[PDB]
Amino acid sequence: IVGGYTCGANTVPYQVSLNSGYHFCGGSLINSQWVVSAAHCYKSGIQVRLGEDNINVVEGNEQFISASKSIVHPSYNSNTLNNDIMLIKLKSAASLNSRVASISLPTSCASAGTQCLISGWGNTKSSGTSYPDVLKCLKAPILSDSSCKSAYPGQITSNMFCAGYLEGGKDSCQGDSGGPVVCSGKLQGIVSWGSGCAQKNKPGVYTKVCNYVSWIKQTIASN
């Protein structure tokens, strides 16, 4: 997260960290035993770590749960970055408290202009690479479909949306992937892709969760 601020310990109780020995992708808790991330964050043997702030060290609120099932969207297309969404089932329900809580799925697509909270432990600098110990936060608005496509001609499908600033300066970055984009209290997006970080005319592109919700609820209801 470049140009953002430190969220504060467990202030984003749904922020999850996918670990494969080390942190490689964010995720979002949607209920006691199902997590949502990006399809491109798929890996075998995922350890989902919840209630985290400082991902490097243990602080007393973490909950380490091995992944049981990792279902990547059937239509994921690694080339086109399309349908970049993945579901994760925990081998064991998570104890929901104040530090660990779920985020409501969006039953309605948010309109452009809506302010969102993007979260993650990714690089916090434009040029250069500096990963944070604790969760970084960032408020950014949903951009219009015409501007999004204006920034990325020929690369935007109806399953993705831009959020951020054409001006640049503030944005999501490497290591934020799979993380949440919560707007008006609902997981409207997932950190997916983008050209560079905080670059001009190159905002973040996120998986449009609202188109996938019916699928999410279905799979959770049959897996």
Binding site: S20, G21, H23, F24, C25, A38, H40, C41, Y42, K43, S44, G45, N77, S78, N79, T80, L81, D84, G122, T129, Y131, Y152, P153, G154, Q155, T157, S172, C173, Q174, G175, D176, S177, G178, V191, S192, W193, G194, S195, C197, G204, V205
Partner: protein, 175 residues
């Protein structure tokens, strides 16, 4: 739990800089630019004529905002230290008297013209090595059914070009 790995057995960091060397130390050194034919400056991507030269530091990037390069992801390869005239440090594939060749452009290029590569590990497992695929877009389904190879020319320049039976192999070394 992933694929793209350098020489030292460490994960290839997205946006980081690496040297691209051959598998067999007899084909050349690292990658670099060169002035070939009728170019106004170094706009041709070739292998170092040297065989011990780490070449030029090269950045490997993916659109994805992950710490590493996701398997099957298309990537762009650019010179960490761009040359003179290049309006972008990123490689692209343009038609030439020789045939499709890896060049640098003086024209600002869009994502589509640069995100046309994709690494592919080799069968001979004894050290992390990869073949470089060339993926030209189609109709919202870019197909990687071609490779990038070496074409030594009239002046000796080992220029990188698109082949289908003379693919090159590479090992990545953190710059």
């Amino acid at each position: 739990d992933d694929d793209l790995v350098d020489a030292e057995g460490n994960l290839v960091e997205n946006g980081g800089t690496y040297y691209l060397l051959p598998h067999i130390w007899a084909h050349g050194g690292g990658i670099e630019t060169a002035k070939t034919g009728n170019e106004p400056c170094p706009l041709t991507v070739v292998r170092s004529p040297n065989e011990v030269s780490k070449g030029e530091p090269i950045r490997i990037s993916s659109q994805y905002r992950s710490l590493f390069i996701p398997r099957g992801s298309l990537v762009a390869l650019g010179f960490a230290n761009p040359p003179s005239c290049a309006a972008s440090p990123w490689w692209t594939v343009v038609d030439s008297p020789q045939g499709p060749a890896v060049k640098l452009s003086q024209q600002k290029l869009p994502e589509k013209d640069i995100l046309v590569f994709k690494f592919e590990k080799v069968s001979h497992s004894n050290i992390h090595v990869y073949k470089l695929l060339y993926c030209q877009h189609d109709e919202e389904d870019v197909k990687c059914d071609q490779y990038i190879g070496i074409h030594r020319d009239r002046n000796g320049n080992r220029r990188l070009v698109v082949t289908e039976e003379n693919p090159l192999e590479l090992v990545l070394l953190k710059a």
